[PDB]
Amino acid sequence: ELQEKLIAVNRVSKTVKGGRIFSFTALTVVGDGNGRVGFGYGKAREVPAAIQKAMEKARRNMINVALNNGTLQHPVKGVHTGSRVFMQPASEGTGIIAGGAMRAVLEVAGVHNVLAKAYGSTNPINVVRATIDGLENMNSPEMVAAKRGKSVEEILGK
Partner RNA sequence: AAAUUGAAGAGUUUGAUCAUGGCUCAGAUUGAACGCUGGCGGCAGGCCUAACACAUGCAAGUCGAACGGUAACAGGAAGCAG
Instruction: List residues binding RNA (CB under 7 A).
Output: 10, 12-15, 20, 81-83, 86, 88, 90-94, 97-103, 115-118, 120-126
CB of 64 to RNA, least distance (A): 25
Nearer of residues 65 and 90 to RNA, judged by Cβ: 90
- Least Cα distance to 43 among 20, 26, 61 occurs for 26
CB of 148 to RNA, least distance (A): 26
DSSP per residue, 101-126: HHHHHHHHHT--SEEEEEEE---HHH
- Least Cα distance to 75 among 55, 90, 96 occurs for 90
CB of 97 to RNA, least distance (A): 5
Nearer of residues 48 and 75 to RNA, judged by Cβ: 75
15 in helix, strand or coil?
A: strand
Nearer of residues 25 and 62 to RNA, judged by Cβ: 25
